[PDB]
Amino acid sequence: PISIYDKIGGHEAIEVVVEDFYVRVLADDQLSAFFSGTNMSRLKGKQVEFFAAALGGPEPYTGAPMKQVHQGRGITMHHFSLVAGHLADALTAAGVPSETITEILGVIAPLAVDVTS
Amino acid sequence: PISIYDKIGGHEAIEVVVEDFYVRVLADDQLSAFFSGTNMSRLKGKQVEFFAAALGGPEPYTGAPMKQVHQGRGITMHHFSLVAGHLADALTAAGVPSETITEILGVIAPLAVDVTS
Ligand code: HEM
Numbered sequence: 001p002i003s004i005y006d007k008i009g010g011h012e013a014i015e016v017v018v019e020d021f022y023v024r025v026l027a028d029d030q031l032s033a034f035f036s037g038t039n040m041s042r043l044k045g046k047q048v049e050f051f052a053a054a055l056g057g058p059e060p061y062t063g064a065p066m067k068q069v070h071q072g073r074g075i076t077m078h079h080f081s082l083v084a085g086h087l088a089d090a091l092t093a094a095g096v097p098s099e100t101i102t103e104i105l106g107v108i109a110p111l112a113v114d115v116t117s
Numbered sequence: 118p119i120s121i122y123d124k125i126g127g128h129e130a131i132e133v134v135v136e137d138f139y140v141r142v143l144a145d146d147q148l149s150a151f152f153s154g155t156n157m158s159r160l161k162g163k164q165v166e167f168f169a170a171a172l173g174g175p176e177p178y179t180g181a182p183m184k185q186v187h188q189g190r191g192i193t194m195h196h197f198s199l200v201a202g203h204l205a206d207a208l209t210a211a212g213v214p215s216e217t218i219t220e221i222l223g224v225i226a227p228l229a230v231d232v233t234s
């Protein structure tokens with residue numbers, strides 16, 4: 001078929017989504033402190049890689065596995081819900097059709113919690 | 118098309134998956150304490166409803182929204198990963214083809230964290 005990545009506009013679309021996503025995440029006073037020690041330019045690059053790779057683009061994901069990145073930080077299920085919500089909101093802002101937003105959340109969310117099955 | 122629910126065997130298949138899922142969840146010493154105060158027979162019924170409804174079956178979900186059920190329990194992102202993993206494992210045990218397991222996790226996981234977009 002066509003990849004989800006291609007369907008939404010390829011690399012540029014991923015960049016747009018990720019930038020808007022991080023605005024929403026870092027604006028959230030329940031989340032922002034988690035990123036106090038983070039190399040943010042590197043993180044955003046890695047997130048573009050993760051999204052692009054997961055949605056079927058040619059970009060390699062060169063980052064770490066999700067469990068090993070996220071563990072030991074005190075991130076709650078509530079925090080995950082907030083993040084997932086900000087992602088859905090960024091895809092909406094970007095103009096992604098709603099059924100494709102659902103598809104993307106369905107690809108990304110399980111991967112974010114180390115399910116690949 | 119056909120619903121995911123129909124594709125996997127309808128109501129009976131949901132019942133099989135849910136029973137095996139709860140064996141895995143309650144066997145997990147990191148999760149089992151969360152259910153100490155729970156009406157378990159009612160919960161399993163509600164989970165069958167949730168899965169069946171979410172996968173396109175005729176069964177109404179009569180339970181509560183995910184945020185309102187799960188909040189204030191100290192459930193972590195790690196706990197969610199464990200649960201999602203047990204779900205994938207139950208679908209594998211049940212013999213669901215792997216691409217359909219991926220589809221199901223993609224439907225269920227975002228709903229579990231109150232994303233509908
Ligand atoms: C859909 C959900 C999520 C996805 C896809 C995701 C993905 C990623 C990726 C790709 C990285 C970069 C990994 C690397 O550098 O190798 C990362 C880092 C990070 N994530 Fe997430 N993540 C998610 C949810 C969360 C949540 C809920 C939190 C809670 C605040 C969070 C906090 C972090 C932090 C703090 C880092 C950076 C660690 C550091 O370099 O200092 N993430 N995530």
Ligand code: HEM
Pocket residue numbers: 077148151152154155156159160163164167179180181182186187192196197198200201204225226228229
């Ligand atoms: C895919 C992930 C999940 C789904 C789809 C899910 C779904 C549900 C549903 C449908 C109920 C019943 C709601 C009602 O009675 O109205 C429920 C209750 C519950 N869930 Fe989850 N859940 C998920 C993840 C988790 C996780 C990660 C925990 C951590 C232990 C958890 C703990 C509970 C508990 C303790 C209850 C019962 C509250 C009670 O009646 O005493 N769930 N969940």
